[PDB]
Coordinates of C-alpha atoms in Angstrom, one line a residue:
Chain G
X1 CA 0.0 0.0 0.0
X2 CA 1.2 3.5 0.7
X3 CA 5.0 3.6 1.5
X4 CA 4.4 5.4 4.8
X5 CA 1.7 2.8 5.5
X6 CA 4.4 0.2 4.9
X7 CA 6.4 2.0 7.5
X8 CA 3.4 1.8 9.8
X9 CA 3.5 -2.0 9.6
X10 CA 6.9 -1.8 11.3
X11 CA 5.4 0.7 13.7
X12 CA 2.5 -1.5 14.6
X13 CA 4.6 -4.6 15.1
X14 CA 7.0 -2.5 17.2
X15 CA 4.1 -1.6 19.5
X16 CA 3.2 -5.3 19.6
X17 CA 6.6 -6.1 21.3
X18 CA 5.7 -3.7 24.1
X19 CA 2.1 -5.0 24.2
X20 CA 3.2 -8.6 24.5
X21 CA 5.9 -7.7 27.0
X22 CA 3.2 -6.1 29.2
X23 CA 0.9 -9.1 28.5
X24 CA 3.5 -11.3 30.0
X25 CA 3.9 -8.8 32.9
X26 CA 0.2 -9.1 33.7
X27 CA 0.6 -12.9 33.7
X28 CA 3.2 -12.6 36.4
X29 CA 0.5 -11.3 38.7
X30 CA -1.1 -14.1 40.7
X31 CA -4.3 -12.7 42.4
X32 CA -7.3 -12.9 40.0
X33 CA -9.1 -10.3 42.1
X34 CA -6.5 -7.6 41.2
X35 CA -6.4 -9.1 37.7
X36 CA -10.0 -8.4 36.9
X37 CA -9.8 -4.9 38.4
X38 CA -7.0 -3.7 36.1
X39 CA -8.4 -5.7 33.2
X40 CA -11.7 -3.9 33.6
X41 CA -9.8 -0.7 33.3
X42 CA -8.1 -2.1 30.2
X43 CA -11.5 -2.6 28.6
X44 CA -13.1 0.7 29.7
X45 CA -10.1 2.8 28.8
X46 CA -9.4 1.0 25.5
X47 CA -13.0 0.8 24.3
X48 CA -13.7 4.5 25.2
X49 CA -10.5 5.5 23.4
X50 CA -11.6 3.2 20.5
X51 CA -15.0 5.0 20.4
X52 CA -13.2 8.3 20.0
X53 CA -10.8 6.8 17.5
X54 CA -13.6 5.5 15.3
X55 CA -15.3 8.9 15.4
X56 CA -12.0 10.5 14.4
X57 CA -11.7 8.1 11.4
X58 CA -15.4 8.6 10.6
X59 CA -14.9 12.4 10.4
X60 CA -11.8 11.8 8.3
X61 CA -13.7 9.6 5.9
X62 CA -10.4 7.8 4.9
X63 CA -10.9 4.4 3.3
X64 CA -9.3 1.6 5.3
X65 CA -8.0 0.1 2.1
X66 CA -6.3 3.3 1.1
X67 CA -3.4 5.7 1.4
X68 CA -1.6 5.8 4.7
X69 CA -3.4 7.9 7.4
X70 CA -1.4 11.1 7.0
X71 CA -3.0 13.9 9.1
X72 CA -1.9 13.5 12.7
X73 CA -5.4 13.6 14.1
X74 CA -6.6 10.7 12.0
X75 CA -3.2 9.0 11.9
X76 CA -3.1 8.6 15.7
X77 CA -6.6 7.3 15.6
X78 CA -5.4 4.7 13.1
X79 CA -2.7 3.7 15.5
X80 CA -5.2 3.4 18.3
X81 CA -7.7 1.4 16.4
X82 CA -5.3 -1.2 14.9
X83 CA -2.8 -1.3 17.8
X84 CA -5.5 -1.3 20.6
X85 CA -7.6 -3.9 18.8
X86 CA -4.5 -6.2 18.3
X87 CA -3.8 -5.9 22.0
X88 CA -7.5 -6.6 22.6
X89 CA -7.1 -9.9 20.7
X90 CA -4.2 -10.8 22.9
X91 CA -6.2 -9.9 26.0
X92 CA -9.2 -11.9 24.7
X93 CA -7.2 -15.0 23.9
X94 CA -5.2 -14.9 27.1
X95 CA -8.2 -14.0 29.2
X96 CA -11.3 -15.3 27.3
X97 CA -13.7 -15.5 30.3
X98 CA -12.8 -12.1 31.8
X99 CA -13.3 -10.2 28.6
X100 CA -16.5 -12.0 27.6
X101 CA -18.1 -11.1 30.9
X102 CA -17.1 -7.4 30.6
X103 CA -17.4 -7.1 26.8
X104 CA -20.1 -9.3 25.4
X105 CA -22.8 -7.8 27.6
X106 CA -22.4 -4.3 25.9
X107 CA -23.8 -4.1 22.4
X108 CA -22.0 -0.8 21.8
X109 CA -18.6 -2.4 22.5
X110 CA -19.2 -5.4 20.2
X111 CA -20.4 -3.2 17.4
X112 CA -17.5 -0.7 17.8
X113 CA -14.9 -3.5 17.8
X114 CA -16.7 -5.1 14.8
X115 CA -16.2 -1.8 12.9
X116 CA -12.5 -1.9 13.9
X117 CA -12.0 -5.5 12.9
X118 CA -13.4 -4.9 9.4
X119 CA -11.5 -1.6 9.3
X120 CA -8.3 -3.6 9.9
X121 CA -9.3 -6.4 7.6
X122 CA -9.7 -3.9 4.7
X123 CA -6.4 -2.1 5.4
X124 CA -4.5 -5.3 5.1
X125 CA -2.4 -4.7 8.2
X126 CA -3.0 -8.2 9.5
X127 CA -1.9 -9.8 6.2
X128 CA 1.9 -10.0 6.7
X129 CA 4.2 -10.6 9.5
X130 CA 3.7 -12.8 12.6
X131 CA 0.7 -10.7 13.8
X132 CA -1.4 -11.3 10.7
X133 CA -3.0 -14.5 12.2
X134 CA -4.1 -12.4 15.2
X135 CA -7.0 -10.8 13.3
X136 CA -8.3 -14.2 12.2
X137 CA -7.9 -15.8 15.6
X138 CA -9.6 -13.0 17.6
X139 CA -12.6 -12.9 15.2
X140 CA -13.0 -16.7 15.6
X141 CA -12.7 -16.4 19.4
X142 CA -15.3 -13.6 19.6
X143 CA -17.6 -15.5 17.2
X144 CA -17.4 -12.7 14.5
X145 CA -15.9 -15.3 12.2
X146 CA -16.5 -19.0 12.0
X147 CA -14.4 -21.0 14.3
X148 CA -12.0 -23.4 12.6
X149 CA -12.3 -27.1 13.4
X150 CA -8.7 -27.1 14.8
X151 CA -9.0 -23.6 16.4
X152 CA -8.8 -24.0 20.1
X153 CA -7.9 -21.2 22.5
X154 CA -5.0 -22.6 24.6
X155 CA -5.9 -20.3 27.5
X156 CA -9.6 -21.2 27.5
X157 CA -9.2 -24.2 29.7
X158 CA -11.8 -25.2 32.3
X159 CA -9.8 -24.6 35.5
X160 CA -12.8 -26.0 37.4
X161 CA -12.1 -29.3 35.6
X162 CA -14.0 -32.1 37.4
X163 CA -14.1 -33.2 41.0
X164 CA -11.1 -35.5 41.5
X165 CA -13.3 -38.5 42.3
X166 CA -10.6 -40.6 40.7
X167 CA -7.6 -40.1 43.0
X168 CA -5.6 -43.3 42.9
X169 CA -2.4 -41.2 42.6
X170 CA -3.4 -39.4 45.8
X171 CA -4.3 -42.7 47.4
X172 CA -0.7 -43.7 46.8
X173 CA 0.4 -40.4 48.3
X174 CA -1.6 -41.2 51.4
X175 CA -0.1 -44.7 51.6
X176 CA 3.5 -43.5 51.3
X177 CA 3.0 -40.7 53.8
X178 CA 1.5 -43.1 56.4
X179 CA 4.2 -45.6 55.5
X180 CA 6.9 -43.1 56.4
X181 CA 5.0 -42.5 59.7
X182 CA 5.0 -46.3 60.2
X183 CA 8.7 -46.6 59.5
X184 CA 9.6 -44.0 62.1
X185 CA 7.6 -45.8 64.7
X186 CA 9.7 -49.0 64.2
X187 CA 12.9 -47.0 64.2
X188 CA 11.9 -45.5 67.5
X189 CA 11.4 -48.9 69.1
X190 CA 14.9 -50.0 68.0
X191 CA 17.1 -47.7 70.2
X192 CA 18.6 -50.1 72.7
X193 CA 17.2 -52.4 75.4
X194 CA 13.8 -51.2 76.6
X195 CA 11.8 -52.6 79.6
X196 CA 9.8 -55.8 79.1
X197 CA 6.0 -56.0 79.5
Chain S
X1 CA -21.6 -19.1 41.8
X2 CA -22.1 -22.4 43.5
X3 CA -25.2 -21.1 45.3
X4 CA -27.2 -17.8 45.2
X5 CA -28.4 -15.8 48.1
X6 CA -26.5 -12.9 49.8
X7 CA -27.6 -12.1 53.3
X8 CA -28.7 -8.5 54.3
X9 CA -27.5 -6.5 57.4
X10 CA -29.3 -6.7 60.7
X11 CA -29.4 -3.0 61.4
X12 CA -30.5 -3.7 65.0
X13 CA -28.8 -6.9 66.1
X14 CA -27.7 -5.3 69.4
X15 CA -30.9 -5.7 71.3
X16 CA -30.7 -9.5 71.1
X17 CA -30.2 -11.0 74.6
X18 CA -28.0 -13.8 75.9
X19 CA -25.9 -13.9 72.8
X20 CA -22.1 -13.8 72.4
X21 CA -20.3 -10.7 71.2
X22 CA -19.6 -11.1 67.5
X23 CA -17.3 -8.1 67.1
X24 CA -14.4 -8.4 69.6
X25 CA -11.8 -8.3 66.8
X26 CA -13.3 -5.1 65.2
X27 CA -13.5 -3.1 68.4
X28 CA -10.2 -4.2 69.8
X29 CA -8.4 -3.6 66.5
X30 CA -8.6 0.1 67.0
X31 CA -8.0 0.7 70.8
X32 CA -5.4 3.3 71.6
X33 CA -2.4 1.4 72.9
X34 CA 0.1 3.5 75.0
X35 CA 3.6 2.1 74.6
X36 CA 2.7 -0.2 71.8
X37 CA 1.6 0.2 68.1
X38 CA -2.2 0.1 67.4
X39 CA -3.2 -3.0 65.5
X40 CA -5.2 -1.0 63.0
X41 CA -2.3 1.3 62.2
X42 CA 0.1 -1.4 61.2
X43 CA -2.5 -2.9 58.9
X44 CA -3.1 0.4 57.2
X45 CA 0.6 0.9 56.6
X46 CA 1.2 -2.3 54.7
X47 CA -2.0 -1.7 52.8
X48 CA -0.5 1.6 51.5
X49 CA 2.6 -0.1 50.3
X50 CA 0.8 -2.9 48.4
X51 CA -2.1 -0.9 47.2
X52 CA 0.1 2.0 46.0
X53 CA 2.2 -0.3 43.9
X54 CA -0.9 -1.9 42.3
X55 CA -2.0 1.6 41.2
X56 CA 1.3 2.0 39.4
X57 CA 0.4 -0.9 37.2
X58 CA -2.7 0.9 36.0
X59 CA -0.5 4.0 35.5
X60 CA 1.8 2.1 33.2
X61 CA -0.9 0.5 31.1
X62 CA -2.7 3.9 30.9
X63 CA 0.3 5.5 29.3
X64 CA 1.0 2.7 26.8
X65 CA -2.6 2.6 25.5
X66 CA -3.5 6.3 25.9
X67 CA -0.3 7.5 24.2
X68 CA 0.6 8.1 20.6
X69 CA 4.3 6.8 20.8
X70 CA 5.3 7.9 17.3
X71 CA 3.7 11.4 17.8
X72 CA 5.8 11.7 21.0
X73 CA 8.8 9.8 19.4
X74 CA 11.5 11.0 21.7
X75 CA 12.4 7.3 21.8
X76 CA 14.0 7.7 18.4
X77 CA 17.4 8.3 20.1
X78 CA 16.8 5.1 22.1
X79 CA 16.3 3.2 18.8
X80 CA 19.3 4.8 17.1
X81 CA 21.8 4.2 20.0
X82 CA 20.3 0.7 20.7
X83 CA 21.2 -0.3 17.2
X84 CA 24.7 1.1 17.7
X85 CA 25.2 -1.0 20.8
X86 CA 23.8 -4.0 19.0
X87 CA 26.1 -3.6 16.1
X88 CA 29.1 -3.2 18.4
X89 CA 27.9 -6.4 20.1
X90 CA 27.6 -8.2 16.8
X91 CA 31.1 -7.3 15.6
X92 CA 32.5 -8.3 19.0
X93 CA 31.0 -11.7 18.6
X94 CA 32.4 -12.0 15.1
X95 CA 35.8 -10.8 16.3
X96 CA 36.2 -13.9 18.5
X97 CA 35.8 -16.2 15.5
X98 CA 37.7 -14.0 13.1
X99 CA 40.4 -11.5 13.9
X100 CA 39.7 -9.5 10.8
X101 CA 36.2 -8.5 12.1
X102 CA 37.7 -5.8 14.4
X103 CA 40.5 -4.9 12.0
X104 CA 38.8 -1.8 10.7
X105 CA 38.1 -0.3 14.2
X106 CA 39.2 -2.3 17.2
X107 CA 37.8 0.3 19.5
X108 CA 34.0 -0.1 20.2
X109 CA 32.5 3.3 21.0
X110 CA 29.6 5.6 19.9
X111 CA 30.3 9.2 19.0
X112 CA 27.5 11.8 18.8
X113 CA 27.9 15.2 17.2
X114 CA 25.0 17.7 17.1
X115 CA 24.8 20.3 14.3
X116 CA 21.9 22.6 15.2
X117 CA 22.8 25.1 12.4
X118 CA 22.5 22.5 9.6
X119 CA 19.6 20.6 11.2
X120 CA 22.0 17.5 11.2
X121 CA 22.6 14.9 13.8
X122 CA 25.7 12.6 13.3
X123 CA 25.8 9.3 15.2
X124 CA 29.0 7.3 14.6
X125 CA 29.4 3.7 15.6
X126 CA 32.2 1.1 15.1
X127 CA 29.9 -1.9 14.8
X128 CA 29.6 -4.6 12.3
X129 CA 28.9 -2.2 9.4
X130 CA 27.1 -2.8 6.2
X131 CA 28.1 -3.7 2.6
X132 CA 26.9 -2.0 -0.6
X133 CA 24.5 -4.9 -1.3
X134 CA 23.3 -4.9 2.3
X135 CA 22.7 -1.2 2.1
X136 CA 20.4 -1.6 -0.9
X137 CA 18.7 -4.7 0.4
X138 CA 18.4 -4.0 4.1
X139 CA 18.1 -0.2 3.9
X140 CA 17.0 0.4 0.3
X141 CA 13.9 -1.8 1.0
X142 CA 12.7 -1.5 4.5
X143 CA 12.2 -4.7 6.5
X144 CA 12.0 -5.2 12.6
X145 CA 14.4 -2.5 11.5
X146 CA 12.6 0.1 13.7
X147 CA 15.8 0.9 15.6
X148 CA 17.4 2.6 12.6
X149 CA 14.1 3.7 11.0
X150 CA 12.7 5.5 14.1
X151 CA 14.9 8.4 13.0
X152 CA 12.6 9.2 10.2
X153 CA 9.8 10.0 12.7
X154 CA 11.7 13.2 13.6
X155 CA 13.8 13.3 10.4
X156 CA 12.8 14.0 6.8
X157 CA 15.9 12.4 5.3
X158 CA 18.5 9.9 6.5
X159 CA 22.1 9.6 5.2
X160 CA 24.0 6.5 6.2
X161 CA 27.7 5.9 5.6
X162 CA 28.4 2.2 6.3
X163 CA 31.7 0.2 5.9
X164 CA 31.6 -3.6 6.5
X165 CA 34.6 -6.0 6.6
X166 CA 33.5 -7.8 3.4
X167 CA 33.0 -4.7 1.3
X168 CA 34.3 -1.1 0.9
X169 CA 32.6 1.8 2.5
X170 CA 29.4 2.9 0.7
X171 CA 26.9 5.7 1.4
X172 CA 23.1 5.0 1.3
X173 CA 20.9 8.1 1.3
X174 CA 17.1 8.1 1.2
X175 CA 14.4 10.7 1.8
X176 CA 11.8 7.9 2.2
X177 CA 10.8 8.4 -1.5
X178 CA 13.9 7.1 -3.2
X179 CA 17.2 5.6 -2.1
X180 CA 20.7 5.9 -3.8
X181 CA 23.8 3.9 -2.9
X182 CA 27.2 5.1 -4.2
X183 CA 30.7 4.3 -3.2
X184 CA 31.9 6.6 -0.4
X185 CA 34.0 9.5 -1.7
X186 CA 36.2 9.5 1.4
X187 CA 36.9 5.8 1.3
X188 CA 37.1 3.7 4.4
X189 CA 37.2 6.6 6.8
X190 CA 35.4 4.6 9.5
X191 CA 37.4 1.5 8.7
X192 CA 34.3 -0.3 9.7
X193 CA 31.0 0.7 11.3
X194 CA 28.2 3.1 10.4
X195 CA 27.9 6.9 10.7
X196 CA 24.3 8.3 10.2
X197 CA 23.8 11.9 9.4
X198 CA 20.2 12.8 10.1
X199 CA 18.4 15.6 8.2
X200 CA 16.0 16.5 11.1
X201 CA 12.6 18.2 10.6
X202 CA 11.8 21.7 11.7
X203 CA 9.9 20.3 14.7
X204 CA 13.1 18.4 15.7
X205 CA 15.2 21.4 16.5
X206 CA 14.9 20.7 20.3
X207 CA 16.6 17.3 19.7
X208 CA 19.5 19.1 18.1
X209 CA 20.1 20.8 21.5
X210 CA 23.2 19.5 23.2
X211 CA 21.4 19.2 26.5
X212 CA 18.4 17.4 24.9
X213 CA 20.5 14.7 23.3
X214 CA 22.4 14.1 26.6
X215 CA 19.1 13.9 28.4
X216 CA 17.8 11.3 25.9
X217 CA 21.0 9.3 26.3
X218 CA 20.5 9.2 30.1
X219 CA 16.8 8.5 29.7
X220 CA 17.1 5.6 27.3
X221 CA 20.7 4.6 26.6
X222 CA 22.3 5.0 30.0
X223 CA 22.6 1.2 30.3
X224 CA 24.5 0.8 27.0
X225 CA 27.7 -1.2 27.8
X226 CA 29.8 0.8 25.3
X227 CA 30.8 4.4 26.3
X228 CA 28.8 7.1 24.6
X229 CA 30.3 10.4 23.6
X230 CA 28.4 13.6 23.1
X231 CA 30.0 16.5 21.2
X232 CA 31.0 19.4 23.4
Chain K
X1 CA -33.1 -4.1 -3.9
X2 CA -32.1 -0.6 -4.9
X3 CA -34.0 1.5 -2.4
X4 CA -34.4 1.2 1.4
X5 CA -37.5 -0.8 2.2
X6 CA -39.1 -0.4 5.7
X7 CA -41.9 -2.5 7.0
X8 CA -43.7 -2.2 10.4
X9 CA -43.7 -5.5 12.2
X10 CA -45.2 -4.4 15.5
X11 CA -47.2 -1.2 16.0
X12 CA -46.5 0.9 19.1
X13 CA -48.7 0.0 22.1
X14 CA -49.9 3.6 22.7
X15 CA -50.4 6.5 20.2
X16 CA -46.9 7.8 19.3
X17 CA -46.6 10.9 21.5
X18 CA -42.9 11.4 20.6
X19 CA -41.6 10.0 17.3
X20 CA -37.9 9.5 16.8
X21 CA -36.1 12.4 15.2
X22 CA -32.6 13.5 14.4
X23 CA -30.6 14.3 17.5
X24 CA -32.6 11.9 19.7
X25 CA -30.8 9.2 21.7
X26 CA -32.3 5.8 20.9
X27 CA -32.0 2.5 22.8
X28 CA -32.7 -0.2 20.2
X29 CA -32.4 -4.0 19.9
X30 CA -31.5 -5.3 16.5
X31 CA -30.7 -8.4 14.5
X32 CA -28.8 -7.9 11.3
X33 CA -28.5 -10.7 8.8
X34 CA -27.6 -11.3 5.2
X35 CA -30.4 -12.0 2.7
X36 CA -29.4 -15.7 2.8
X37 CA -30.2 -15.9 6.5
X38 CA -26.7 -15.8 8.0
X39 CA -26.8 -13.7 11.2
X40 CA -24.2 -10.8 11.2
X41 CA -24.8 -9.6 14.7
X42 CA -27.7 -9.5 17.2
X43 CA -28.2 -7.4 20.4
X44 CA -31.2 -9.4 21.7
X45 CA -29.0 -11.2 24.3
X46 CA -27.1 -8.0 25.3
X47 CA -27.9 -4.5 26.6
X48 CA -29.8 -2.3 24.1
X49 CA -27.6 -0.5 21.6
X50 CA -27.4 3.2 22.3
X51 CA -27.1 5.5 19.2
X52 CA -27.7 9.2 18.5
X53 CA -29.6 9.8 15.3
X54 CA -27.4 11.8 12.9
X55 CA -24.0 10.8 14.3
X56 CA -23.3 8.0 11.7
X57 CA -22.8 5.4 14.4
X58 CA -24.7 2.7 12.3
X59 CA -25.0 2.0 8.6
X60 CA -26.9 4.8 6.7
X61 CA -29.9 2.5 5.9
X62 CA -30.4 1.5 9.5
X63 CA -30.2 5.2 10.7
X64 CA -32.8 6.2 8.0
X65 CA -35.0 3.2 9.0
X66 CA -35.1 4.4 12.6
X67 CA -36.5 7.9 11.7
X68 CA -40.1 8.3 13.0
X69 CA -39.9 5.0 14.9
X70 CA -42.1 4.9 18.0
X71 CA -41.3 3.3 21.4
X72 CA -42.4 -0.3 21.3
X73 CA -42.5 -0.5 17.5
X74 CA -40.6 -3.2 15.6
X75 CA -39.5 -2.6 12.0
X76 CA -37.7 -4.7 9.3
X77 CA -35.4 -2.8 7.0
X78 CA -34.0 -4.2 3.8
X79 CA -31.0 -2.0 3.0
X80 CA -29.3 -1.8 -0.5
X81 CA -25.6 -2.2 -0.7
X82 CA -24.9 1.5 -1.2
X83 CA -26.7 2.3 2.1
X84 CA -25.1 -0.5 4.2
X85 CA -21.5 -1.6 3.7
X86 CA -21.1 -0.5 0.0
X87 CA -18.5 -1.9 -2.3
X88 CA -16.0 -2.7 0.5
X89 CA -18.3 -4.9 2.6
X90 CA -17.7 -5.7 6.2
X91 CA -15.1 -8.5 6.3
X92 CA -15.1 -11.1 7.7
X93 CA -18.9 -11.1 8.2
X94 CA -20.5 -9.3 5.3
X95 CA -19.4 -9.8 1.6
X96 CA -19.0 -7.0 -0.8
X97 CA -22.1 -5.2 -2.2
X98 CA -24.3 -7.2 0.2
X99 CA -27.9 -6.4 0.8
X100 CA -28.7 -6.7 4.5
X101 CA -31.8 -7.0 6.7
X102 CA -32.2 -5.6 10.2
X103 CA -35.1 -6.3 12.5
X104 CA -35.1 -3.5 15.1
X105 CA -37.2 -2.8 18.2
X106 CA -37.2 0.6 19.8
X107 CA -36.9 0.0 23.5
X108 CA -36.6 3.6 24.9
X109 CA -36.1 7.1 23.5
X110 CA -34.1 9.8 25.3
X111 CA -34.6 13.1 23.8
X112 CA -34.4 15.2 26.9
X113 CA -37.3 17.5 27.6
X114 CA -35.9 21.0 27.8
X115 CA -38.2 21.6 30.8
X116 CA -37.1 18.3 32.4
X117 CA -33.4 19.1 32.2
Chain E
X1 CA -9.9 -22.2 84.6
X2 CA -6.9 -24.0 86.1
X3 CA -7.1 -26.9 83.5
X4 CA -6.9 -24.4 80.6
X5 CA -3.6 -22.7 81.6
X6 CA -1.8 -24.1 78.6
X7 CA -4.1 -22.1 76.3
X8 CA -2.6 -18.6 75.6
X9 CA -4.4 -16.0 73.6
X10 CA -1.3 -14.7 71.9
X11 CA -0.5 -18.1 70.5
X12 CA -3.4 -17.8 68.1
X13 CA -2.2 -14.4 66.7
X14 CA 0.4 -13.7 64.0
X15 CA 3.7 -12.3 65.2
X16 CA 2.3 -8.9 64.4
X17 CA -0.7 -9.3 66.8
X18 CA -3.2 -10.1 64.0
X19 CA -6.0 -12.6 63.8
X20 CA -6.0 -14.0 60.3
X21 CA -7.2 -17.2 58.7
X22 CA -5.1 -16.9 55.5
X23 CA -1.7 -18.4 54.6
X24 CA -0.1 -15.9 57.1
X25 CA -2.2 -17.1 60.0
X26 CA -0.8 -18.5 63.1
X27 CA 0.0 -22.2 62.8
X28 CA -1.9 -23.1 66.0
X29 CA -5.0 -21.3 64.6
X30 CA -5.0 -23.2 61.3
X31 CA -4.7 -26.6 63.1
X32 CA -7.3 -26.0 65.8
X33 CA -10.4 -28.0 65.8
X34 CA -12.8 -25.2 65.0
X35 CA -10.8 -24.1 61.9
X36 CA -10.9 -27.6 60.4
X37 CA -14.7 -28.1 61.1
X38 CA -15.7 -24.8 59.5
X39 CA -13.4 -25.1 56.5
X40 CA -13.5 -28.8 55.8
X41 CA -13.8 -29.2 52.0
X42 CA -14.5 -25.5 51.7
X43 CA -11.3 -24.7 49.8
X44 CA -12.6 -25.9 46.4
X45 CA -16.0 -24.1 46.7
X46 CA -16.4 -20.9 44.6
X47 CA -18.2 -18.4 46.9
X48 CA -17.9 -15.6 44.3
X49 CA -17.4 -15.4 40.6
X50 CA -15.0 -12.5 41.1

């Protein structure tokens, strides 16, 4: 596309490095209770910013499949829409349940992101590089696009799993533990000559 | 989730008779203690430490998302110097296998000269360097490469003089519209490494300032292993 | 389908005291689909979509179809390609030059009474 | 009472003088009869979604 837009592809991927670096940083946190609190701020700040960004592009009336966003007012909005949405895909994939609770409920948020996703899909930004699959994966995750037969969110595991009714490994753990308890008892008796009943 | 039903508050429990006090902890946790530290006070203190730090995480994310990075691209110096350190690192690794790698310039340093009058910034490094073919391929066609190419955010035109061990010194110049590579008139002045002369934009005059460049070096490139020199 | 087609599915329960007009804030539920029946998006399981008429927050045909809508009314709008997503479409969900259908119910209308403000 | 002399209130507190049932709670408190009865099998229950 436009040569400056080609430069933007490097710019967008560059932001991705920081976005993924932070994404790992959030993973380092352990408490879910803090995690949702900040994540909720992620959605409210990002989506509200996205709402302004779409309005900025709407006033600009610049085709997504077109020349590089040049005017700084629209161009920053283009950075926000593509970059924030790409991070939104990482957040959705890494944290599917959290986002869905705080995002699916609001029709405005889904419609606004849907405009962004098509807006990215027409620009061609997610066509080259290692972040091009992100647009396909996030749409599938959100149900905007059909889920592939082999498409599974690695993070979307059922941590609740199922009650460990089958615990033969834990039964062995119990045995060995009690067995060590039994071994010490015998060792105690050893010592030297005790009294006789 | 497992069950539903959240109790309400008994606004007037106190009247109940022959019942045990269900609030000892709460009351006792705030009693003034002479020659001792009040239980409530210690709790508050740690809370401030932990809670304050947590707020900082929101702060960091807020900036990253709410920013415009390229609009406020003061990081361009970080990108430029970071490449210079990387190239010096690469040549150092090559030097161990091959003695000739460091033959052009054994000394590994970065020299920065600021030319405010000409709107030019000169960054000289003694790193791996680049051949004529590499200048056309790597630089003539872009691509991360952001480290060098961040300069264009504040610069209209970039001039690169690069000498690599395998080739003679060549100069690649581009204004982002077209690029030309020609043999360096001065020859192997660097011996090996790259010197970038940056044709800054009008808005970038502040970067030309000697104090500003030094502040950027401290802000982003303070941790570079190789010594950094600023013209003075 | 070259022109916007609007059909009233459900009439308003009470005589329309305040018909929707430009500038009003509308809460609406909608189901958008392609002409072949594939659902593009639906708000029926979510909170109502909040839009201001005239702000170009939805496709032109949908905004036009909401004019003069009454609270409690349901309409079906068949929107030609040039008033919906045009030649570019809405990938990955809407092909190029697609005609779309929206079933919409007006749930609430907030034009603020100047006296009430 | 005389028979209960072994029971000391401070033993059930954290070193900082706190009554807590979390990981930082006093070892005696976590292993007392009452704590086990109230919290038997309660660890795996989700009280709240959040």
